[PDB]
Every structure is written in structure tokens, then in C-alpha cells.
Symmetry: D2
Subunit: 108 residues, 4 copies
Amino acid sequence: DNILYSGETLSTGEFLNYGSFVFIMQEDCNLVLYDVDKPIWATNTGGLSRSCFLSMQTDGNLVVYNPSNKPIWASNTGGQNGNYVCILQKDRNVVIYGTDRWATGTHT
Amino acid sequence: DNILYSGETLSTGEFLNYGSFVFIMQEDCNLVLYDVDKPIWATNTGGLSRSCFLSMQTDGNLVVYNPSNKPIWASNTGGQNGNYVCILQKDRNVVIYGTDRWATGTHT
Amino acid sequence: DNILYSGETLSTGEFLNYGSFVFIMQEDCNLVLYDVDKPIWATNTGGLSRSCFLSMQTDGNLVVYNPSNKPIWASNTGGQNGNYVCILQKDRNVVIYGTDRWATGTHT
Amino acid sequence: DNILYSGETLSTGEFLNYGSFVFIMQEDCNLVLYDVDKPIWATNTGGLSRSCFLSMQTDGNLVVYNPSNKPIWASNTGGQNGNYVCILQKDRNVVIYGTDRWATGTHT
Ligand SMILES: CO[C@H]1O[C@H](CO)[C@@H](O)[C@H](O[C@H]2O[C@H](CO)[C@@H](O)[C@H](O)[C@@H]2O)[C@@H]1O
Ligand SMILES: CO[C@H]1O[C@H](CO)[C@@H](O)[C@H](O[C@H]2O[C@H](CO)[C@@H](O)[C@H](O)[C@@H]2O)[C@@H]1O
Ligand SMILES: CO[C@H]1O[C@H](CO)[C@@H](O)[C@H](O[C@H]2O[C@H](CO)[C@@H](O)[C@H](O)[C@@H]2O)[C@@H]1O
Ligand SMILES: CO[C@H]1O[C@H](CO)[C@@H](O)[C@H](O[C@H]2O[C@H](CO)[C@@H](O)[C@H](O)[C@@H]2O)[C@@H]1O
Ligand SMILES: CO[C@H]1O[C@H](CO)[C@@H](O)[C@H](O[C@H]2O[C@H](CO)[C@@H](O)[C@H](O)[C@@H]2O)[C@@H]1O
Ligand SMILES: CO[C@H]1O[C@H](CO)[C@@H](O)[C@H](O[C@H]2O[C@H](CO)[C@@H](O)[C@H](O)[C@@H]2O)[C@@H]1O
Ligand SMILES: CO[C@H]1O[C@H](CO)[C@@H](O)[C@H](O)[C@@H]1O
Ligand SMILES: CO[C@H]1O[C@H](CO)[C@@H](O)[C@H](O)[C@@H]1O
Ligand SMILES: CO[C@H]1O[C@H](CO)[C@@H](O)[C@H](O)[C@@H]1O
Ligand SMILES: CO[C@H]1O[C@H](CO)[C@@H](O)[C@H](O)[C@@H]1O
Ligand SMILES: CO[C@H]1O[C@H](CO)[C@@H](O)[C@H](O)[C@@H]1O
Ligand SMILES: CO[C@H]1O[C@H](CO)[C@@H](O)[C@H](O)[C@@H]1O
């Protein structure tokens, strides 16, 4: 999958992926974007903890929490409560979108 | 693919798809959401033209244009110029998100 | 997913899918290949039962069984015990391959 | 895509991919299987050339050729002319299957 929907959570070792791109939430708490084996981006918080989990919040903030729930990193885009999506785009860019503007409402 | 990014266009017969869900821009100009062979949603503009094309605009408006460029249908969510995405979600709901809030900027 | 590996089973309502193609094992026991809403192929065994399940066997036979385990349909390609795969190809052709010839053995 | 069909070719930098798994035909001619950034398997032919291309042949042989068309590596599973598939399985195992046993013939 390449979309982390608001209200979801990438646990340790979990990741979004598309093509050769992998946005992985590592064990050492380093959220890294790899292009195959090459590191492309990273929160550079590796080692600050263990077993962290990336969380896309409804307020719009993309936060990396440690097991103790202390936030290690965050996009700081928190504020408007609503629906949001974190997408690992086809052009190798992880982007946050929101709030939702329209929907067919065909939701299950 | 299950994401129509703003600035993109589904031509006739083109579609977003995910699982058994297919959000197709048909020849008869009817934008329909199918769950396998069952119709789920539709703009109900079938027959109003031929060779239409769905366009996700930068202003946020999701418009169905005919070859003559006259809009046959639209979400009317036009307004704020920016980046938007139309996603055929995993829960069978086509939703529009925007503007973009954050990005790793790792864009190619 | 677009691959049913030998030893696996599509239950009722389950399906392989790729693009707009959906190879679905229906409730009425009719294994049908749809191209969006258009039926393309089918075992034409609909109604012969309820709650059937498609099974890709290790002997190479692709069988549609009813809950009572009586085979309703089968490719009759049974014979050589081994590894096989049923693939819903990108050209809209469901094909069976086997046995396996080579592998990196990198298996988890 | 995670299937290289017989008669197809991964050029330099091209790759099969699934999940965090990427079976890439590198510039240095090293066909490597990575699990994110960790190398898992490799033909160990890196440096033997430049701009190689992986080819899944109809005879069943999986060969890595150099631009000069000299084979640098091969699975040596050549022999029976027919249809074959190289699949980067969900269990992180690259496997070759063939020949084809059955098909709905729905081919486009
Ligand atoms: C400096 O290493 C940290 O940041 C790198 C990117 O800047 C990551 O690649 C790295 O993770 C990978 O390597 C470490 C070992 O150095 C390993 O523990 C991890 O599982 C990855 O393989 C680390 O986060
Ligand atoms: C300052 O709080 C915002 O930013 C923090 C990280 O910089 C987040 O931890 C914080 O999230 C928490 O509070 C919000 C609002 O109460 C809640 O919705 C979320 O689940 C966390 O508990 C917020 O984003
Ligand atoms: C009433 O038919 C229109 O709207 C339906 C949904 O309400 C669509 O399913 C339908 O499209 C499909 O059927 C038509 C023929 O009726 C066919 O031209 C089209 O390619 C689809 O198969 C149509 O849009
Ligand atoms: C003749 O109907 C059977 O075979 C068709 C293909 O030849 C299928 O499309 C059909 O399944 C679909 O329609 C039936 C109702 O006729 C419905 O029960 C099923 O869920 C599908 O929508 C059926 O198998
Ligand atoms: C020993 O290096 C070769 O084999 C490795 C696996 O055994 C590959 O990872 C490696 O490729 C990667 O690194 C090289 C530089 O050492 C780089 O040229 C290539 O693009 C990959 O990043 C190489 O094939
Ligand atoms: C010994 O030939 C087989 O193995 C070689 C590598 O070990 C392959 O290069 C070779 O392939 C070539 O010949 C076959 C048969 O003529 C042809 O189909 C293929 O396209 C290559 O030209 C064969 O696999
Ligand atoms: C109630 O939530 C659902 O519907 C909204 C819009 O109606 C979507 O944005 C969201 O992702 C879900 O599909
Ligand atoms: C009123 O203009 C807006 O809406 C129409 C359709 O309603 C689009 O054609 C146009 O580009 C704008 O999005
Ligand atoms: C310049 O556009 C790119 O970057 C923005 C955010 O920087 C994304 O929203 C967009 O989809 C592209 O990837
Ligand atoms: C004759 O036996 C074979 O074929 C039938 C269906 O024809 C399967 O049920 C069985 O497991 C074997 O594959
Ligand atoms: C033991 O089974 C595994 O390995 C064989 C080849 O070794 C594959 O064909 C099969 O799908 C599994 O990945
Ligand atoms: C003629 O080739 C097509 O059909 C055969 C079986 O008929 C498949 O194996 C192959 O991949 C193609 O789809």
C-alpha cells in the first residue's frame, strides 16, 4: 500500500511502498525513505528509541511516537481536525493532503 | 493506479482501480463506480456526449468535460488553487483531498 | 493480488484481480472473468450450488468445489505433483504454469 | 509489476518488485534481490560489464546478457520452448514456472 490514512499507524518495520520506493518506520525509530538501497530522506531520529510507530493523526499532524508515547518527531502540521492521507507518490515524494473536500460517499 | 493527481486526466475508457473497485470514465460520458459488475455510483450523465474525459483540476474541482470542453458534470469543489488528489480508497469511497499540507520534498 | 498459488483457495466472493480485470469465484458457484462490468469468461456452473470455492491444487488441477466438496468444475490439468501458479495476466488471460523450474531459494 | 513474462526483458536499472522486495538488474550487471536496503541474493556478476539486461527466454532459460549479447549469467533452465513466467513471489522467492498448462484463452 502507498497510503497511510488518518487514524492509521505504521508500527515498527511497517512501511508504505510504491515501485522501488519504500517509506519505512524502522526499529531504531528512524523514519527513512529509500530508493531501493539508497537512503533518500530520514527524520534522523535513529537511535533515539526502539519500537517506534508512525502515526497519521486526524488533526493533520504526522507524528513518530516511541512506545512510551513521547513524540520523537512530527511534521507539526497539526491543527484542523478532519480526514487526511499520507501518500508515497509515484514521483518519490511523501505528501500529506487534507482535509477531504468531496466524496461519492460510496464508503463501506 | 488508484490516485488521480491534480493536473491529470482520465480519458475515455480510462479508470482508477483498486481491489474489485473500478472508477471508470466511460465512452458515453458516464463516470461510474463499479464493485465488480455492480454499479455503485454514477454521475448519471451517460448519453449526454461521447468521448468525455475526467479531469482533476488544480483549483480543486473534479470536472467531467466533453470533447468540446463543455463541462458535463463537476464536483463544484473549485476554488483554492493548489495540489489535490482524487483517491479511490480501500473502503470503496472516491474522495478528494487538498490542499497539500506537508511533504518530504523528495520529489523527482 | 493476481496470483493464486498452488495450495491456496479463493472462497466465495474472493477473486484475483488486475487492472479492470476481475477473476471472481461467485456465491452461485460461477467462476467468471469480468472486464469491468462485462462478463468475459465463465465456467457456466452458476446455480449448481452455493458457497463454492476455487482451489489451485498441487497436482496442477484447477478445481471449483462446492461446500460438500464435490467438484463442480475443473481444468482437468491434474497429474504432476508440484508447485503451480494461476495468474490473471496483464493481457486479460488467466493461465496456469508449472511445475517450477528454478528459484533463488530466497524463500521466507 | 512482479512478473517478468517469457519474451520480456528487464533493462539496466529495471526491476521486478513486490512489497519491500525488489529484484533489480543493476548497471554494474549484478542481478540482486533486496529486502529494503538489505541484499538477499545476487548473481555476483557485478562489475563484469555495464548496461546488462535480464531476459526471460521462451526456452525457459533466465539469462543476464551484456550489451555485446554475451551471457554473463543464466539459470541454465533452457530447453523446452514455450511460455514461462519469472515471479517475485510474496514470500520473497524469485521462481520460474512453465510451461503453461491451461488458460481461459481470454487473451487480448
Ligand atoms: C545512520 O543510520 C540510520 O539512518 C540511516 C539513514 O540516514 C538508515 O539507513 C539506517 O538504517 C539502516 O541501517 C541501520 C544500521 O546502520 C539498520 O539498523 C537499519 O535496520 C537499516 O538497515 C539508520 O536508521
Ligand atoms: C502539540 O500537539 C500536537 O503535536 C504533537 C507532536 O508535536 C502531537 O503529539 C499531538 O497529538 C496528540 O494530541 C492530539 C490532540 O489532542 C491528539 O489528536 C493526538 O492523538 C495526540 O494525542 C498534536 O498533534
Ligand atoms: C444506464 O446506463 C448507463 O449508466 C449505468 C450505471 O447507471 C452504466 O452501467 C452504463 O454503462 C454500462 O452499460 C452501457 C450500456 O447500457 C455500456 O454502454 C457501458 O459501456 C457500460 O457497459 C451506462 O453508463
Ligand atoms: C447468467 O448469470 C450467471 O453467469 C453470468 C455470466 O455468464 C454472471 O454475470 C452472473 O453473475 C452476476 O449476476 C448474477 C445474477 O444474474 C449475480 O447473482 C452475481 O452475483 C453476479 O452479479 C451469474 O453467475
Ligand atoms: C558488492 O557490490 C555489488 O553487489 C552488492 C550485493 O552483493 C550490491 O549491493 C552492489 O550494488 C549496490 O552498490 C553498488 C556499489 O557497491 C552500486 O554500484 C549499486 O548501484 C548498488 O547501490 C553491487 O552490485
Ligand atoms: C546454451 O544456450 C542456452 O543458454 C544460453 C545461456 O547459458 C542462452 O544464451 C541461450 O539462448 C540463446 O539461444 C536460444 C536458442 O537458440 C534463443 O532462444 C535465445 O534467444 C538466445 O539466442 C540458451 O538459453
Ligand atoms: C466517514 O469517512 C469516510 O468518508 C469520508 C468522506 O465522506 C472519507 O474522507 C473517509 O476517508 C472515509 O471514506
Ligand atoms: C466555474 O468554473 C469552475 O467550475 C467549472 C465546472 O463547474 C470548471 O470548468 C472550471 O474550470 C472551474 O473549475
Ligand atoms: C511541486 O509538486 C510536488 O511537490 C508537492 C509538495 O511539495 C506535491 O504535493 C506534489 O504532488 C509534487 O510531488
Ligand atoms: C480425478 O481427480 C482429479 O480431478 C478432480 C476433479 O476433476 C479433483 O477433485 C482431484 O483432486 C484431482 O485433481
Ligand atoms: C518450498 O516452496 C517455496 O520454494 C519453491 C521453489 O524452491 C517455490 O516454487 C514455492 O512457491 C515456494 O516459494
Ligand atoms: C498465446 O499466448 C497467450 O496465451 C497463452 C496460453 O493460451 C498464455 O500462456 C500467454 O501468456 C498469452 O496470454
